[PDB]
Amino acid sequence: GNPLVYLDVDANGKPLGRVVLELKADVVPKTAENFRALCTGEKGFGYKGSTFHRVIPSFMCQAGDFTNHNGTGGKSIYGSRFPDENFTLKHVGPGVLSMANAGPNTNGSQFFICTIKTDWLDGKHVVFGHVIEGMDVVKKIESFGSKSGRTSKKIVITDCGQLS
Numbered sequence: 001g002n003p004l005v006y007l008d009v010d011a012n013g014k015p016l017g018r019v020v021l022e023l024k025a026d027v028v029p030k031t032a033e034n035f036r037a038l039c040t041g042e043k044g045f046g047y048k049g050s051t052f053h054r055v056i057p058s059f060m061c062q063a064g065d066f067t068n069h070n071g072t073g074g075k076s077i078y079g080s081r082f083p084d085e086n087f088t089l090k091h092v093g094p095g096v097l098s099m100a101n102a103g104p105n106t107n108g109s110q111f112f113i114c115t116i117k118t119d120w121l122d123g124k125h126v127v128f129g130h131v132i133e134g135m136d137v138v139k140k141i142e143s144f145g146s147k148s149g150r151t152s153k154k155i156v157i158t159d160c161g162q163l164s
Protein backbone atom coordinates (compact mmCIF):
# COMPACT_ATOMS: atom_id res chain seq x y z
CA GLY A 1 0.00 0.00 0.00
CA ASN A 2 0.68 3.68 0.19
CA PRO A 3 3.20 4.96 2.67
CA LEU A 4 2.15 6.69 5.89
CA VAL A 5 4.79 9.17 7.09
CA TYR A 6 5.07 11.73 9.96
CA LEU A 7 6.49 15.14 10.77
CA ASP A 8 6.89 16.19 14.44
CA VAL A 9 6.99 20.03 14.52
CA ASP A 10 8.04 22.62 17.16
CA ALA A 11 7.82 26.44 17.41
CA ASN A 12 10.89 28.06 19.08
CA GLY A 13 11.69 24.71 20.73
CA LYS A 14 8.19 23.95 21.96
CA PRO A 15 6.31 20.89 20.41
CA LEU A 16 3.21 21.55 18.46
CA GLY A 17 2.41 17.88 17.70
CA ARG A 18 2.52 15.40 14.75
CA VAL A 19 1.36 15.68 11.15
CA VAL A 20 0.64 12.26 9.57
CA LEU A 21 0.57 12.14 5.73
CA GLU A 22 -0.53 9.48 3.20
CA LEU A 23 1.73 9.46 0.13
CA LYS A 24 -0.15 8.50 -3.08
CA ALA A 25 2.41 6.00 -4.44
CA ASP A 26 -0.44 4.37 -6.39
CA VAL A 27 -0.76 7.57 -8.56
CA VAL A 28 2.67 9.32 -8.35
CA PRO A 29 5.17 6.67 -7.28
CA LYS A 30 8.31 8.67 -8.09
CA THR A 31 7.15 11.83 -6.21
CA ALA A 32 5.85 9.80 -3.26
CA GLU A 33 9.12 7.87 -3.02
CA ASN A 34 11.20 11.06 -2.95
CA PHE A 35 9.21 12.47 0.00
CA ARG A 36 9.16 9.09 1.87
CA ALA A 37 12.95 8.77 1.72
CA LEU A 38 13.48 12.40 2.73
CA CYS A 39 11.34 11.65 5.81
CA THR A 40 13.32 8.57 6.83
CA GLY A 41 16.73 10.15 6.05
CA GLU A 42 17.88 6.82 4.52
CA LYS A 43 19.87 8.46 1.67
CA GLY A 44 21.94 10.50 4.25
CA PHE A 45 20.02 13.76 3.92
CA GLY A 46 16.41 14.92 4.45
CA TYR A 47 13.90 16.91 6.38
CA LYS A 48 14.91 16.28 10.01
CA GLY A 49 16.12 19.49 11.64
CA SER A 50 14.82 21.83 8.87
CA THR A 51 12.11 24.49 8.86
CA PHE A 52 8.74 25.72 7.58
CA HIS A 53 10.26 28.87 5.90
CA ARG A 54 7.20 30.35 4.15
CA VAL A 55 3.82 30.26 5.87
CA ILE A 56 0.85 32.32 4.51
CA PRO A 57 -2.40 32.24 6.55
CA SER A 58 -5.44 31.30 4.54
CA PHE A 59 -3.21 29.72 1.89
CA MET A 60 -0.48 27.22 2.75
CA CYS A 61 2.50 26.15 4.85
CA GLN A 62 5.78 25.58 2.87
CA ALA A 63 8.85 23.61 3.92
CA GLY A 64 11.59 21.29 2.60
CA ASP A 65 14.55 23.62 1.96
CA PHE A 66 16.90 21.65 4.13
CA THR A 67 20.07 23.26 2.70
CA ASN A 68 19.38 27.01 2.79
CA HIS A 69 16.27 27.36 4.94
CA ASN A 70 14.75 30.07 2.74
CA GLY A 71 13.31 28.68 -0.46
CA THR A 72 16.44 28.83 -2.49
CA GLY A 73 17.71 25.26 -1.75
CA GLY A 74 16.88 21.56 -1.27
CA LYS A 75 17.44 18.61 -3.57
CA SER A 76 15.69 15.35 -4.48
CA ILE A 77 16.87 11.78 -3.87
CA TYR A 78 17.39 11.57 -7.69
CA GLY A 79 19.51 14.67 -8.23
CA SER A 80 18.99 18.40 -8.02
CA ARG A 81 15.58 18.43 -9.77
CA PHE A 82 13.14 15.96 -11.34
CA PRO A 83 10.22 16.06 -13.78
CA ASP A 84 6.56 16.73 -13.04
CA GLU A 85 5.27 13.18 -12.78
CA ASN A 86 1.62 13.87 -13.61
CA PHE A 87 -1.20 16.26 -12.59
CA THR A 88 -3.85 13.58 -11.90
CA LEU A 89 -4.48 14.61 -8.26
CA LYS A 90 -6.03 18.10 -7.70
CA HIS A 91 -5.84 20.81 -5.06
CA VAL A 92 -9.30 19.99 -3.67
CA GLY A 93 -9.16 21.52 -0.18
CA PRO A 94 -7.25 22.00 3.04
CA GLY A 95 -4.81 19.16 3.88
CA VAL A 96 -3.55 18.61 0.28
CA LEU A 97 0.25 17.85 0.14
CA SER A 98 1.83 19.25 -3.11
CA MET A 99 5.31 20.01 -4.57
CA ALA A 100 6.66 23.57 -4.62
CA ASN A 101 8.54 24.51 -7.80
CA ALA A 102 10.13 27.27 -9.88
CA GLY A 103 8.27 26.35 -13.02
CA PRO A 104 7.83 23.19 -15.14
CA ASN A 105 10.05 20.23 -14.20
CA THR A 106 11.81 21.82 -11.24
CA ASN A 107 10.75 19.55 -8.34
CA GLY A 108 13.33 19.09 -5.58
CA SER A 109 12.51 18.68 -1.89
CA GLN A 110 10.33 21.74 -1.14
CA PHE A 111 6.60 21.01 -0.54
CA PHE A 112 3.50 22.64 0.89
CA ILE A 113 0.43 21.67 2.94
CA CYS A 114 -2.71 23.63 1.88
CA THR A 115 -4.93 25.34 4.47
CA ILE A 116 -7.54 26.20 1.83
CA LYS A 117 -8.59 24.86 -1.64
CA THR A 118 -5.82 26.09 -3.99
CA ASP A 119 -7.32 24.94 -7.35
CA TRP A 120 -5.51 27.65 -9.31
CA LEU A 121 -2.42 25.45 -8.78
CA ASP A 122 -3.97 22.49 -10.68
CA GLY A 123 -1.80 21.44 -13.62
CA LYS A 124 1.15 23.49 -12.27
CA HIS A 125 2.10 21.74 -8.97
CA VAL A 126 2.19 17.95 -8.53
CA VAL A 127 -0.16 16.80 -5.74
CA PHE A 128 1.12 13.65 -4.06
CA GLY A 129 -0.74 13.08 -0.76
CA HIS A 130 -2.81 14.50 2.04
CA VAL A 131 -3.09 14.91 5.83
CA ILE A 132 -4.46 11.78 7.64
CA GLU A 133 -4.06 13.25 11.17
CA GLY A 134 -2.92 16.55 12.58
CA MET A 135 -4.72 19.25 10.64
CA ASP A 136 -4.91 20.97 14.06
CA VAL A 137 -1.10 20.97 14.09
CA VAL A 138 -1.02 22.49 10.57
CA LYS A 139 -3.40 25.23 11.81
CA LYS A 140 -0.96 25.95 14.65
CA ILE A 141 1.94 26.31 12.11
CA GLU A 142 -0.38 28.58 9.98
CA SER A 143 -0.86 30.88 13.04
CA PHE A 144 2.81 31.67 13.14
CA GLY A 145 2.94 32.86 9.52
CA SER A 146 2.06 36.22 7.91
CA LYS A 147 0.83 37.61 4.68
CA SER A 148 4.47 38.19 3.54
CA GLY A 149 5.24 34.47 4.30
CA ARG A 150 7.67 35.32 7.02
CA THR A 151 7.24 33.38 10.25
CA SER A 152 7.15 34.98 13.71
CA LYS A 153 8.68 31.94 15.44
CA LYS A 154 11.21 29.32 14.20
CA ILE A 155 9.06 26.35 13.01
CA VAL A 156 11.22 23.18 12.98
CA ILE A 157 10.66 19.58 11.84
CA THR A 158 12.30 18.13 14.95
CA ASP A 159 11.69 14.47 13.82
CA CYS A 160 10.17 12.64 10.84
CA GLY A 161 9.89 9.13 9.45
CA GLN A 162 7.70 6.33 8.20
CA LEU A 163 4.89 4.61 10.15
CA SER A 164 4.00 1.98 7.54
Ligand SMILES: CCOC(=O)CNC(=O)NCc1cccc(-c2ccncc2)c1
Nearest residue numbers: 051053054069070149150151152153154
Ligand atom coordinates in the same frame (compact mmCIF):
# COMPACT_ATOMS: atom_id res chain seq x y z
C1 LIG B 1 9.55 34.17 3.36
C2 LIG B 1 10.96 34.75 2.99
O1 LIG B 1 11.95 34.41 3.93
C3 LIG B 1 12.48 33.15 4.33
O2 LIG B 1 12.16 32.16 3.76
C4 LIG B 1 13.54 33.21 5.41
N1 LIG B 1 13.76 31.87 6.03
C5 LIG B 1 13.14 31.58 7.23
O3 LIG B 1 12.50 32.49 7.89
N2 LIG B 1 13.28 30.30 7.69
C6 LIG B 1 12.64 29.90 8.95
C7 LIG B 1 13.53 30.39 10.14
C8 LIG B 1 14.92 30.08 10.18
C9 LIG B 1 15.68 30.58 11.27
C10 LIG B 1 15.05 31.40 12.27
C11 LIG B 1 13.67 31.77 12.19
C12 LIG B 1 13.06 32.61 13.27
C13 LIG B 1 13.67 32.68 14.59
C14 LIG B 1 13.05 33.44 15.57
N3 LIG B 1 11.91 34.10 15.28
C15 LIG B 1 11.30 34.07 14.09
C16 LIG B 1 11.86 33.34 13.04
C17 LIG B 1 12.94 31.26 11.13
Ligand SMILES: CCOC(=O)CNC(=O)NCc1cccc(-c2ccncc2)c1
Nearest residue numbers: 071080081100101102106107108110112
Ligand atom coordinates in the same frame (compact mmCIF):
# COMPACT_ATOMS: atom_id res chain seq x y z
C1 LIG C 1 2.45 27.35 -2.98
C2 LIG C 1 3.70 26.79 -3.61
O1 LIG C 1 4.54 27.95 -3.92
C3 LIG C 1 5.72 27.76 -4.61
O2 LIG C 1 6.03 26.69 -5.11
C4 LIG C 1 6.44 29.05 -4.77
N1 LIG C 1 7.73 28.87 -5.40
C5 LIG C 1 8.84 28.66 -4.71
O3 LIG C 1 8.85 28.77 -3.48
N2 LIG C 1 9.91 28.40 -5.45
C6 LIG C 1 11.26 28.08 -4.96
C7 LIG C 1 11.56 26.66 -5.36
C8 LIG C 1 10.71 25.70 -4.84
C9 LIG C 1 10.93 24.39 -5.18
C10 LIG C 1 11.92 23.99 -6.07
C11 LIG C 1 12.76 24.94 -6.67
C12 LIG C 1 13.80 24.45 -7.67
C13 LIG C 1 14.42 23.20 -7.65
C14 LIG C 1 15.32 22.84 -8.65
N3 LIG C 1 15.62 23.64 -9.70
C15 LIG C 1 15.01 24.86 -9.76
C16 LIG C 1 14.10 25.23 -8.76
C17 LIG C 1 12.55 26.28 -6.28
Ligand SMILES: [K+]
Nearest residue numbers: 056058059147
Ligand atom coordinates in the same frame (compact mmCIF):
# COMPACT_ATOMS: atom_id res chain seq x y z
K1 LIG D 1 -3.22 36.19 -2.02
